[PDB]
Structures are given as C-alpha cells and as structure tokens.
C-alpha cells in the first residue's frame, strides 16, 4: 500500500 496515491 503506497502512502501517497491509492492508484494501482
């Protein structure tokens, strides 16, 4: 899980 975008 990226902390700066929820985009896949």
């Amino acid at each position, epitope marked *: *899980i990226n*902390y*700066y*975008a*929820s*985009e*896949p």
Partner: single-chain antibody, 232 residues
Framework: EVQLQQSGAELVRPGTSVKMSCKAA????????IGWVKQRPGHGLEWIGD????????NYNEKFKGKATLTADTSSSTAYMQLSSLTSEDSAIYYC??????????WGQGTSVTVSGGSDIVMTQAAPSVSVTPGESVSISCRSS???????????LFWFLQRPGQSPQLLIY???NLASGVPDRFSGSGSGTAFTLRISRVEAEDVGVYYC?????????FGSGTKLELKV
C-alpha cells in the same frame, strides 16, 4: 468487522462551512486510504478525494480543490471532511469508504448536508433504468473512455448497488471478481472499455441504482447509474 460511523445530518446556510466526521473501527486505521463520495440528487455519485491516515497525504479531484479539505486524527481513528463556501450545489449525502487494495468495500452510512477534467476517464451507462419481474435475468451496460487494463493485468472496473435509503455496496471488483458477501447471481464481464453486470434470478433485494466506477487513475469516476425496479 470493519465499521465506518459518520456524524449526523447537517442543516446549514449558504456561505458557511461544515465539518463532518467518519469514525473508523475494526481494522488498522493508518494502513488504508479513506475515500469520500458525494451523492447529490440527479448527479449520481461523484468522487471527492482520498486520504491516507498514516502519511496524512491527501489527493483531491480537481473539482473539489478549494471546496473540500480532508484530515485525519489517529488518536480517535477519525477521518474528517470540511466544506467551505456552502451553496445549494453542496446539498448532498457524503460517504466515507475504506479502500481495500482498490476495493471500496466498506462504506459509512452517509452524512446528509442540506444547504437551505478533460483527461478524466468518462464512465457512461446508457440505460437510465431497467424494469424487470422477479426471477428474470438482466444485463446492465457500462463503458469507459479509455481502457481500464493496467500493466499488472487487472482491469480496474467496479460495480456497486445502492439500495433505496442505503449506502452503496460493492458487488464486483476488478471487472469480474465477486465481492465477499454478494450472491453469485451477480457476475461481471467486459472488454476493458465496455462492461456488463449480469444479475440472474432478480429479487426484491436487488432493487436500487447500479453504478460502474473506475479506480485506475485519479480522479476516480462513476457512471451515471442504472436504476433497477420491479415491473409496471
């Protein structure tokens, strides 16, 4: 179980601000994004932005940059949204939803507020409604303005049902996958740019508005909805 418990209805006047809350429980608050969605009559569902309570970083739909402010409090596991310069356009129900690996599978109950982009992916749903008799099967179509296929191999198309007086619920994720708790009478297929939700053996519990949504690229976008009702 995951719970998202939103603050109460607001009756407010134009030109003011309002701040609403979304209390999370049943999972690690700082691990997942929380998105916010606006449900305004005649205007379907519209995505506002999201926030990561671990980093406090927020992403906004450009349409809401200068309207909405997302914050989070890790002490109380609460996400907040503040709206400024309220107008009639802001009268709506506002939902928070937890993003689980791109799935908006957990939704708050909504907060009602009553006020007394060229490159965005456009999602279309040609049918405003479908009228069916119980036990009939039905197909609902959606199209996206660009492919929703990602380099990882997944197609980031989602279907939701919003039953009358309820929050949206996730039915199908990543084009074809059945969400937990949803009957396997629901299925999804598509080409990456055109999609079909199929419902076999329709029953009264299936009544409501069906929305497609893309979670490929910010801003996330929803189709205009197709209302399912039982027949004339």
């Amino acid at each position: 179980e995951v719970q998202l418990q939103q603050s109460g209805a607001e009756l407010v006047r134009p030109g003011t601000s309002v701040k609403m809350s979304c209390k999370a429980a049943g999972y690690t608050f700082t691990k997942y994004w929380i998105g916010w969605v606006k449900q305004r009559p005649g205007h379907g569902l519209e995505w506002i932005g999201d926030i990561h309570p671990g980093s406090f970083y927020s992403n906004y739909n450009e349409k809401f940059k200068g309207k909405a402010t997302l914050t989070a409090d890790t002490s109380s596991s609460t996400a907040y949204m503040q709206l400024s310069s309220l107008t009639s356009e802001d009268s709506a129900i506002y939902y928070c939803a937890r993003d689980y690996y791109t799935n908006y599978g957990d939704w708050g109950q909504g907060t009602s507020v009553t006020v007394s982009g060229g490159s965005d992916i456009v999602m279309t749903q040609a049918a405003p409604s479908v009228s069916v008799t119980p036990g009939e099967s039905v197909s609902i179509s959606c199209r996206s303005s660009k492919s929703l296929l990602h380099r990882n191999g997944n197609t980031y198309l989602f279907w939701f049902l919003q039953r009358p007086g309820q929050s949206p619920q996730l039915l199908i994720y990543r084009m074809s996958n059945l969400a937990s708790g949803v009957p396997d009478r629901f299925s999804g297929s598509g080409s990456g740019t055109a999609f079909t939700l199929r419902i076999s053996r329709v029953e009264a519990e299936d009544v409501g508005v069906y929305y497609c949504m893309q979670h490929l690229e910010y801003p996330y976008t929803f189709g205009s909805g197709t209302k399912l009702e039982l027949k004339v």
